Amino acid sequence: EAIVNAQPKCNPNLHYWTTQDEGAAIGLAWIPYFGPAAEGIYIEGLMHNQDGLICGLRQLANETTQALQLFLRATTELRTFSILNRKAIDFLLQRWGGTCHILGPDCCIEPADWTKNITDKIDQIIHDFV
Amino acid sequence: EAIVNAQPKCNPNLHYWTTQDEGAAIGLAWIPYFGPAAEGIYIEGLMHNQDGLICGLRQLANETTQALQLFLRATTELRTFSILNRKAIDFLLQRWGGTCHILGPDCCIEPADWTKNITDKIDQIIHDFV
Amino acid sequence: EAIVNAQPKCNPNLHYWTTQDEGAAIGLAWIPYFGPAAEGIYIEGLMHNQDGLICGLRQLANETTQALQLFLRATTELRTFSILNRKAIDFLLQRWGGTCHILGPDCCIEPADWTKNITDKIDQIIHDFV
Ligand SMILES: *[C@@H]1O[C@H](CO)[C@@H](O[C@@H]2O[C@H](CO)[C@@H](O[C@@H]3O[C@H](CO[C@H]4O[C@H](CO)[C@@H](O)[C@H](O)[C@@H]4O)[C@@H](O)[C@H](O[C@H]4O[C@H](CO)[C@@H](O)[C@H](O)[C@@H]4O)[C@@H]3O)[C@H](O)[C@H]2NC(C)=O)[C@H](O)[C@H]1NC(C)=O
Ligand SMILES: *[C@@H]1O[C@H](CO)[C@@H](O[C@@H]2O[C@H](CO)[C@@H](O[C@@H]3O[C@H](CO[C@H]4O[C@H](CO)[C@@H](O)[C@H](O)[C@@H]4O)[C@@H](O)[C@H](O[C@H]4O[C@H](CO)[C@@H](O)[C@H](O)[C@@H]4O)[C@@H]3O)[C@H](O)[C@H]2NC(C)=O)[C@H](O)[C@H]1NC(C)=O
Ligand SMILES: *[C@@H]1O[C@H](CO)[C@@H](O[C@@H]2O[C@H](CO)[C@@H](O[C@@H]3O[C@H](CO[C@H]4O[C@H](CO)[C@@H](O)[C@H](O)[C@@H]4O)[C@@H](O)[C@H](O[C@H]4O[C@H](CO)[C@@H](O)[C@H](O)[C@@H]4O)[C@@H]3O)[C@H](O)[C@H]2NC(C)=O)[C@H](O)[C@H]1NC(C)=O
Ligand SMILES: NC(=O)C1CCN(CCOc2ccc(-c3[nH]ncc3-c3ccccc3)c(O)c2)CC1
Ligand SMILES: NC(=O)C1CCN(CCOc2ccc(-c3[nH]ncc3-c3ccccc3)c(O)c2)CC1
Ligand SMILES: NC(=O)C1CCN(CCOc2ccc(-c3[nH]ncc3-c3ccccc3)c(O)c2)CC1
Ligand SMILES: NC(=O)C1CCN(CCOc2ccc(-c3[nH]ncc3-c3ccccc3)c(O)c2)CC1
Ligand SMILES: NC(=O)C1CCN(CCOc2ccc(-c3[nH]ncc3-c3ccccc3)c(O)c2)CC1
Ligand SMILES: NC(=O)C1CCN(CCOc2ccc(-c3[nH]ncc3-c3ccccc3)c(O)c2)CC1
Ligand SMILES: *[C@@H]1O[C@H](CO)[C@@H](O)[C@H](O)[C@H]1NC(C)=O
Ligand SMILES: *[C@@H]1O[C@H](CO)[C@@H](O)[C@H](O)[C@H]1NC(C)=O
Ligand SMILES: *[C@@H]1O[C@H](CO)[C@@H](O)[C@H](O)[C@H]1NC(C)=O
Numbered sequence A, B, C: 001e002a003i004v005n006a007q008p009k010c011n012p013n014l015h016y017w018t019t020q021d022e023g024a025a026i027g028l029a030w031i032p033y034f035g036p037a038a039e040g041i042y043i044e045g046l047m048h049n050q051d052g053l054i055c056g057l058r059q060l061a062n063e064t065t066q067a068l069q070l071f072l073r074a075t076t077e078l079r080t081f082s083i084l085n086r087k088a089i090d091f092l093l094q095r096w097g098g099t100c101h102i103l104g105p106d107c108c109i110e111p112a113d114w115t116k117n118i119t120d121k122i123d124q125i126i127h128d129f130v
Helices: A050-074 A083-096 A112-119 B050-074 B083-096 B112-119 C050-074 C083-096 C112-119
Strands: A014-019 A042-047 B014-019 B042-047 C014-019 C042-047
Touching: A083 B083, A083 C083, B083 C083
Parallel strands: none
Antiparallel strands: A014 A042, B014 B042, C014 C042
């Protein structure tokens, strides 16, 4: 489905915070005893509405809520951390949970370079037939 | 292994309860503030002993207990939610954790339609050899 | 990267403890009510420095700490149990997260026995051409 922003307004810029994902700490700053307190672990960035991604994302978060709330209602876990890992598992099961029938629409196996390897081998025995 | 029910008795019908997995909520019922309390989130169904699945399942649950208890004894997690996700991961690793040697007994890759694609291409160069 | 032990010393033998992974319990010992208390669930073993694995492992644990501490700083989970399962997921995604182009360096599909199946089928139509 496409995402249709249907909110009263949209802030087209996203000034975000998160935790660092790349690069090493400086010196001993990685040691809990020496490093930042809880308030000082955040990085910041700014994203603009290229391709309408920001207004689309605001709408996406809004539309996700019902399914997410129903999921939380049905779980007995007090705090849920496993949603993305389960999505990754389901991604793999969708493609590799059954036998991969080559050339089928649900088998992500490309023998294109494998054809060029065998279609070039036709002249290996049919051309070399002295 | 096959499942041999060895219990004193078997209730051949399973009147079960669980949480809903399909279909949307009605109106605002998905909102925690408005929706059912803890006691009202359950659906019910009834299953009969077709193929002996119910008596088999009672025996299966009984026989699972030792391995499950030994697993719980060895974990330090207070509440364990990850068993099924780990089974899914192990399902994928069993089939895709190594190189898939096509035509081997442990490689779930079907080139049957791939043969028909190349065995039909024999007359592409051997029949068209004017 | 290779592992260079750069510690002041290395105990080349590893006298370890862990929990049992194989074989069934004896009699009723798997029942929590009857089985060992928390202190009695451990097995022990001894490993020597063949292939330098023990001194390498001491260095590996030391070198892992920075990345592990930075990971723990950034998580909101109070107790983290999911690291190995996430590694397994990432192992599968690295190999099977995209289309597998046969004969490419990132596609773990071996058609070697598949070649022998088709290269032996060359004389199925070219040799049998009466
Ligand atoms: C995802 O995005 C959508 C769209 O932005 C949000 O939709 C909102 O949904 C809520 C309901 O959950 C709406 O709130 C309701 O608005 C009704 C209409 O309000 C107007 O009514 C008067 C009289 O006509 C107008 O003059 C005036 O402009 C008001 O704005 C109210 O009548 C509702 O209040 C009544 O019902 C509630 C129960 O729902 C009672 O508790 C109240 O006491 C009262 O009796 C209610 O407030 C809201 O209007 C919707 N917004 C839009 C733009 O459509 C989603 O909420 C959002 N999802 C999430 C998870 O954020
Ligand atoms: C999976 O399914 C199987 C099969 O249904 C269950 O097997 C039961 O296992 C328990 C043991 O955990 C058995 O309980 C034991 O029964 C012994 C025999 O009881 C009979 O003995 C008298 C005298 O001969 C008979 O006349 C009478 O019919 C009794 O039924 C008892 O002797 C045992 O009690 C003694 O030992 C226990 C320690 O185990 C002490 O605590 C007691 O105080 C007492 O000294 C014990 O009660 C039970 O009989 C088995 N059932 C069957 C049908 O074989 C599994 O339990 C089940 N698994 C799970 C997880 O539920
Ligand atoms: C992985 O393995 C490596 C290598 O074994 C470990 O490296 C150690 O790192 C710590 C720092 O975290 C080092 O400790 C520091 O040592 C400094 C040097 O100590 C020497 O200084 C005097 C004067 O020259 C010498 O005569 C004497 O031999 C001392 O040994 C100290 O100066 C440091 O103390 C000062 O700084 C700290 C802040 O870091 C203050 O808190 C102190 O009060 C003081 O002002 C500090 O003690 C240690 O020397 C390193 N060892 C080696 C062998 O290099 C890693 O720690 C290890 N990783 C983990 C996670 O265990
Ligand atoms: N797997 C793991 O352990 C790690 C652990 C911690 N990581 C945290 C980093 O999460 C993000 C998420 C998003 C962005 C990000 N980039 N650009 C725009 C946005 C952005 C987009 C929408 C709304 C807000 C921000 C980012 O920079 C980092 C996540 C994964
Ligand atoms: N070479 C290709 O694949 C083509 C060419 C380049 N295309 C553009 C991809 O542009 C983005 C934009 C954003 C993020 C991104 N980072 N963090 C958070 C977000 C994010 C934020 C809001 C909404 C969605 C995502 C990103 O990762 C990539 C993709 C297709
Ligand atoms: N992945 C996820 O998030 C969801 C979250 C919540 N879901 C709960 C639904 O679980 C079941 C389990 C079983 C049946 C079920 N159907 N028929 C017979 C039986 C049945 C068989 C044996 C004993 C009792 C009942 C069912 O209807 C639903 C589980 C997965
Ligand atoms: N087309 C095929 O694959 C063939 C043809 C159809 N066969 C029959 C499958 O019948 C069932 C029965 C039950 C459930 C089921 N749902 N929920 C819980 C249970 C469940 C309950 C107790 C014990 C085991 C399972 C199910 O899902 C499917 C399968 C092979
Ligand atoms: N997946 C699961 O549920 C299970 C649950 C519990 N299991 C615990 C067993 O963990 C180990 C780890 C290591 C060894 C082990 N063998 N030889 C040498 C060493 C060893 C090497 C380095 C340092 C110490 C010891 C071992 O015997 C068992 C883990 C997995
Ligand atoms: N046939 C092949 O694959 C070849 C031939 C045989 N080679 C030797 C493998 O030797 C080991 C050594 C150790 C463990 C092991 N167990 N538990 C913990 C540890 C462990 C402890 C410290 C450091 C790393 C690991 C193991 O499992 C296997 C491997 C390649
Ligand atoms: C694939 O092509 C290479 C040449 O790039 C060739 O040497 C090789 O033999 C071909 N593959 C097989 C299985 O013959
Ligand atoms: C597979 O068969 C189709 C005809 O259905 C043919 O057009 C195609 O070329 C074949 N595949 C290859 C790689 O040639
Ligand atoms: C693979 O080789 C076997 C002989 O071991 C042969 O019977 C079979 O037909 C070959 N595969 C195909 C797809 O023809």
